Structure formats: structure tokens, C-alpha cells
Amino acid sequence: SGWTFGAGPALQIPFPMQMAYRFNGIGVTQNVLYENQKLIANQFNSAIG
Amino acid sequence: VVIGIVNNTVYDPLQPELD
Ligand SMILES: *[C@@H]1O[C@H](CO)[C@@H](O)[C@H](O)[C@H]1NC(C)=O
Ligand SMILES: *[C@@H]1O[C@H](CO)[C@@H](O)[C@H](O)[C@H]1NC(C)=O
């Protein structure tokens, strides 16, 4: 759900679009995530590992 | 490079006024 579960009813939303929202919230455009999605995913997986 | 994009058309606020 993202952040909607803590401010009211839960709203379904894809995780990449939630990441795009979180990147746009700090000033970074959504294109760098919708284009370089595999790199961000691999970096996140490497960090989790 | 975008994964999950579909084909669609966008509108132009200049073409109908110019043509
Ligand atoms: C959603 O994920 C499924 C499973 O990988 C895939 O088959 C489908 O094409 C995806 N849809 C979009 C719009 O990316
Ligand atoms: C979009 O159009 C291109 C060529 O016009 C085609 O190769 C592609 O398969 C189309 N995609 C969808 C989701 O219709």
C-alpha cells in the first residue's frame, strides 16, 4: 500500500510506482527510476544481502 | 527501456488551433 495504510484506508499500488513517488518526493524525477529500474533493483538486492 | 508501458496517444494544445 505504501503510506496509505497509516493515514486511512489501504490503497493498492505497484511497488515501482511507490518508489517513483518516493523519488519524486525528494526532488528526483521519476524517469531515472522508470528507466534504470534493473540497476536500482540489483543495488537494493545487494544491500539486503 | 521502460518496462510495462502501453501504446496510447496524447493530445496537443497547439495542433488544432494551428490547423
Ligand atoms: C506484471 O507481472 C507479470 C509477472 O511477471 C507479467 O507477466 C506482466 O507482464 C506484468 N505486467 C506489466 C504491465 O508489467
Ligand atoms: C506498440 O506498438 C509497437 C509498434 O507500433 C509494437 O511493436 C508493440 O508491440 C505495441 N505494444 C503494445 C502493448 O501494443
Chain B residues closer than 8 Å to A32 by CB: none
d(CA A18, CA A2): 6
For chain A, say whether B6 makes contact (Cβ under 8 Å): no
d(CA A10, CA A33): 24
d(CA B14, CA A34): 28
Give yes or no for residue B8 CB within 6 A of ligand 2.
no
Which technique was the structure solved with, according to the deposited record? cryo-EM
Dihedrals phi, psi of A4, to nearest 5 degrees = -75, -20
d(CA A19, CA A38): 13
Chain A residues closer than 8 Å to B1 by CB: 35-36
d(CA B9, CA B11): 7
Dihedrals phi, psi of B5, to nearest 5 degrees = -90, 145
Torsion of CA A2, A45, A35, B13, to 10 degrees: 0
Contact A37, A18 (CB under 8 A): no
Contact A18, A24 (CB under 8 A): no
The 8-class DSSP code of residue A30 comes to: T
